[PDB]
Amino acid sequence: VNSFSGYLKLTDNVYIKNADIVEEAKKVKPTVVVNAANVYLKHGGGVAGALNKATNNAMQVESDDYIATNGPLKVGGSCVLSGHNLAKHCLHVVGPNVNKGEDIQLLKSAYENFNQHEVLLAPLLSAGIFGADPIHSLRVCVDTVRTNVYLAVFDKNLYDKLVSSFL
Ligand SMILES: O=C(O)CNC(=O)c1cccc(O)c1
């Protein structure tokens, strides 16, 4: 038994809710929140900007030190950093950005990072401003992630379509 409430069960291990992931992280304070990162950890908008804003920019300060030491992530890659006031840890995962020409086949590699963590609060990777079809992203999630994932979908209209079209 964990602290997540009001999620619709899709599979053995995948759960979904219409929720602001920032508000969800503040309420639950999960072990791991997933950020929809880019390779530079420049948290300007969507999930990364909202979580970064909720940390009062401490996520961006930490991220800049990480990049100055280690260089950019890979598309499909991740790093673990502090969760600040939102979570124990933030798993920054880079899904492919369709609006930048990145290989959508990298979405499965991106989701494989979640398997290193027993439980996560996460967005649908490569959805929103990353330009992928959220229906596709949910299918890859269900077919790739084996650990327990709690998906927060910001848009109520998209949430209802994700549930009602789920195979
Ligand atoms: O849910 C998604 O797939 C995309 N969500 C966002 O971009 C987002 C989530 C929470 C706050 C916010 O300003 C944007």
Swiss-Prot record:
Residues 1-167 form the Macro domain. It catalyses: Thiol-dependent hydrolysis of ester, thioester, amide, peptide and isopeptide bonds formed by the C-terminal Gly of ubiquitin (a 76-residue protein attached to proteins as an intracellular targeting signal). Inhibited in vitro by GRL-0617. Changing residue 31 to A: In strain: Mu/B.1.621. It is a multi-pass membrane protein. It is found in: Host endoplasmic reticulum membrane. May form homohexamers. Interacts with N protein. Responsible for the cleavages located at the N-terminus of the replicase polyprotein. Participates together with nsp4 in the assembly of virally-induced cytoplasmic double-membrane vesicles necessary for viral replication. Antagonizes innate immune induction of type I interferon by blocking the phosphorylation, dimerization and subsequent nuclear translocation of host IRF3. Also prevents host NF-kappa-B signaling. In addition, PL-PRO possesses a deubiquitinating/deISGylating activity and processes both 'Lys-48'- and 'Lys-63'-linked polyubiquitin chains from cellular substrates. This is Papain-like protease nsp3. It comes from Severe acute respiratory syndrome coronavirus 2 (2019-nCoV). The gene is rep.
